[model samples]
Target chain A: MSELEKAVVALIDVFHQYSGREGDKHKLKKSELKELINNELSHFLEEIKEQEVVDKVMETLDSDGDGECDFQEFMAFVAMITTACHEFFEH
Target chain B: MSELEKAVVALIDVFHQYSGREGDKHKLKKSELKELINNELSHFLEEIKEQEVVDKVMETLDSDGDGECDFQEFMAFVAMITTACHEFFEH
Candidate 1:
């Protein structure tokens, strides 16, 4: 696999590492999402130290209001973060 | 950086590698996009062996009709491919 392909697979693998921890093996509950960000994206994003922040982040990513983030939702969040990083590096 | 964070950076790096090839340094021209898909995503997506396929892909991703793909547009494409891979692995 190419580097980009491997990266894509890594993203999916990381998501599953958290999402499969509890309820809905295919989705991420608020806690799962919080931990995923704090542990995996600590350098890129602010740590999710507050429940309110976790709730807000979940609300933003859970566009369907399902209270859980599916793979599609997770990818959207990743895209947003990656775009921010890209812009930061560009300037 | 965590594995996921590194993956995100890798994605941004791959995009710039292609987008910076010619013309706009921040966007991917049709030829650049084609080369990127063929070279970086060859395992995940079919090789862009035809001009029609390349044009169609550019049309799909160039949501703003800018005839080129910016970082946001490129990230969207990555999100789409990642989601597809996630779904495939789920089943």
Candidate 2:
């Protein structure tokens, strides 16, 4: 929690700074995160999306996958892909 | 469906993967997409953030002006901005 504080909040905030538009109708909460991945990152996900993103993330982070995510597993997500996009861009 | 699928889903998911991190206080059902758009797409809505983008989109797309956007109306959106922001950096 030092600096990262709530890691999820930090990452989501960063996401907002990266690609959001002010007046659009978003999916409410994390649902919006799901929606954005499909639309924006479609190509990035090897071109076509698989259920793995939602499933794996929900499974790993949920610990129970009861449709809600916890804190610790969530941070694992941060470690997962923070700079991958930039690296992808460069190569 | 043709090949494109539901446009809203496609659009919103794009926002998520481009910027989503795994944890944080994502609004239960309608939450995840919130901060993603709030922060991620912040740049897309740069033009003074008129009264309502959702309203404008719905007004133009909904016909009845409901909060949701339908298929035909959604297509008009396709006409509105052909360029995908995720691929925005080619220039």
Candidate 3:
């Protein structure tokens, strides 16, 4: 597979590693989402402990209002972080 | 770096490998974008040859109305593709 392909797969892999921890095993509850961000994205995304902030973020990510963050929603969050990181390094 | 971090860096690295081919050195021109998709993303994203399709893609990626595709725009495109791939595998 190409580097890009591996990268995308890695993203999916990382998502599942966390999402499969508890409950649905296909969606990330707030705790799993928090753990993934802190464990895998600490360099770019800081740990989230603030409850209100986490709630708001989950609310935004829960595009379907399903209350659980799925892979598609997680990808959106990753995209936003990646874009911001690129801008930071570019400037 | 963690695997996730390495993954995002791989994405940035792949973009530069093609975007740095010619002109601008920062944004991707049509040829660069075409080469990128055809070379790196052929597995998930097929080679785009039709001028109109390429034009539409570039138009979408060039969100700032500048005819060139920047990192953020490219990241958005990747996000959309990655999301689709995740859904494909999930279902």
Candidate 4:
């Protein structure tokens, strides 16, 4: 599968796993998201970690009115963020 | 370079060449796409600007309904859009 497609699947898996423990609490508080990010996301992002920064990124992807983010929402968010970084890091 | 290898190279070159200019028109409109997401995504992601979202962070950098994104086309869009932030800037 393409990297993104695979990411989607992996994301689903994370939610499924995390949900079992933190059901209905998908939004993950700022701190929680921050930790999850440090241990989980950094491996790939290698560029993100802070809660403030994470918050900004989430808002960008959470384009819809909802406070919470779903799979598609998250993916699109990632796409936008990555594209931006690729643009900036280049400079 | 690998498929992803060339992508990184082109990404850097984008800003290197166009970071200079006189416009923000495109900056406000166009956005970023992630790159080299590899195994980590979402929790990590394949992109730029929103480095913190964990929702994020490529090149020629983009294509679709077709085959993979080639270098020239991919780079032009990937590196060039924000590429031209002087002309465009989001609210």
Candidate 5:
């Protein structure tokens, strides 16, 4: 696979590693989302140290309001973070 | 860096590899975008076999009508593709 393909697969892999640990297995409940962010995105984002912060993040990502973030929602969050990284490097 | 952080950096690297080749240094022009899809995403997406197809894709991605895809647009494309891949693995 190309680097881009591998990267995409890695994102999916990371999501499942956390999301599969509990509940729906394919969706990220608040705790799963919090863990994924703190574990996988610590380099790019601040660590989720507070429950209120996690709640705010889930509310923002959970556009469907199902209280769990599906893959689409997860990807949207990734895109936002990736875009921020891109912009940061531009300056 | 974590696996997820590496993946995100890989994505940014891939975009610059193509986007820096010509024209704008931070955006993907039509030909650049075509080459990127054919070269880096060939495993997951169909090859861009026609000019019209590239034009249509650019049109869809360039929501701002800038005639080129910035990093945000590119990340959005990646998000859509990644979401599709996640769904594919779910079934």
Candidate 6:
């Protein structure tokens, strides 16, 4: 697979690795989402380790507000982070 | 780095790899976008090899309709493709 393809696959794989650790094997509740950000995105957003920050992130990411984040929602968040990184490196 | 972190970085890296090969150093014109999908996302979307399909994708992804895809636009497109892949593999 190409590097981009492998990266996409890894994104999905990583999401599931966290999502499956809690309730709803296909979705990420607040705790799962927090764990994902703290572990996977620590360098991107070091402040996400706080509970209030996690709740805020979940609220913003949970478009449906179902109190959980599905793969689509997670991808949106990832995109945002990726975009920020791109902008940072662009300058 | 974690797999997810590496994947996110790779996504950014791949975008620049193609974006830097053309007219704009930070944006992907139609041809560049097509080449990117053809080379990187070929297995994920074999049909993108067609001119019409590539044009359609560029149109849909070029949300700002600026006639070129910047990193933000590219990331949005990546997010959509990744989301679709996640759904496909979920079943």
True contacts kept of each: 0.92, 0.00, 0.68, 0.03, 0.83, 0.78
Give the alpha carbon lDDT tens digit for every residue of B3-69 in model 3.
8888888888988898899999998999898888888888887689897877988988888988989
Error of 3 at B9 (Å): 1.1
Cα deviation in Å at residue A86, candidate 6? Answer: 1.6
Error of 3 at A46 (Å): 2.9
iRMS values for every prediction? 0.9, 16.3, 1.4, 12.2, 0.9, 1.1
**Candidate 4 accuracy as lDDT:** 0.40
DockQ of each: 0.84, 0.02, 0.65, 0.05, 0.80, 0.75
For residues A1-47, write the lDDT of model 4, one tens digit per residue: 43433333444454334323443554443344444445555433555
Ordered from best to worst lDDT, the candidate numbers read 1, 5, 6, 3, 4, 2
Show pairs that collide, candidate 5: none
Cα error of candidate 6 at position B62, Å: 1.0
Better of 4 and 6 by DockQ: 6
Worst 10 residues of 5 chain A by lDDT: A82-91
- lDDT, candidate 2, A1-91, per-residue tens: 2111123233444345422443322211245445545654564443324565666545654555445443333333333333244234354
CA lDDT of A41 in candidate 2? 52
Instruction: Give candidate 1 regions above 4 Å deviation.
Output: A89-91, B89-91
Candidate 2 lDDT (Cα, 0 to 1) = 0.37
Alpha-carbon runs more than 4 Å astray in model 6? A47-49, A89-91, B47-49, B89-91
lDDT by residue (tens digit), candidate 1, B1-91:
9999889999989999999999999999999999999999888888989999999999999989889999899888988888789778453
Model 5, range A49-74, lDDT digits (tens) per residue?
Answer: 99999999999999998999998888
Off by over 4 Å in 4: A1-8, A19-32, A44-51, A80-91, B1-91
Error of 5 at A57 (Å): 1.1
What lDDT would each prediction earn against the true structure? 0.91, 0.37, 0.85, 0.40, 0.91, 0.85
RMSD of each: 2.1, 18.4, 2.8, 14.6, 2.2, 2.4
Candidate 6: CAPRI quality band: medium
- Fnat measured on candidate 1: 0.92
Candidate 2 segments whose C-alpha is farther than 4 A from its true place: A1-10, A14-33, A39-44, A47-53, A83-91, B1-91
Worst 10 residues of 5 chain B by lDDT: B82-91
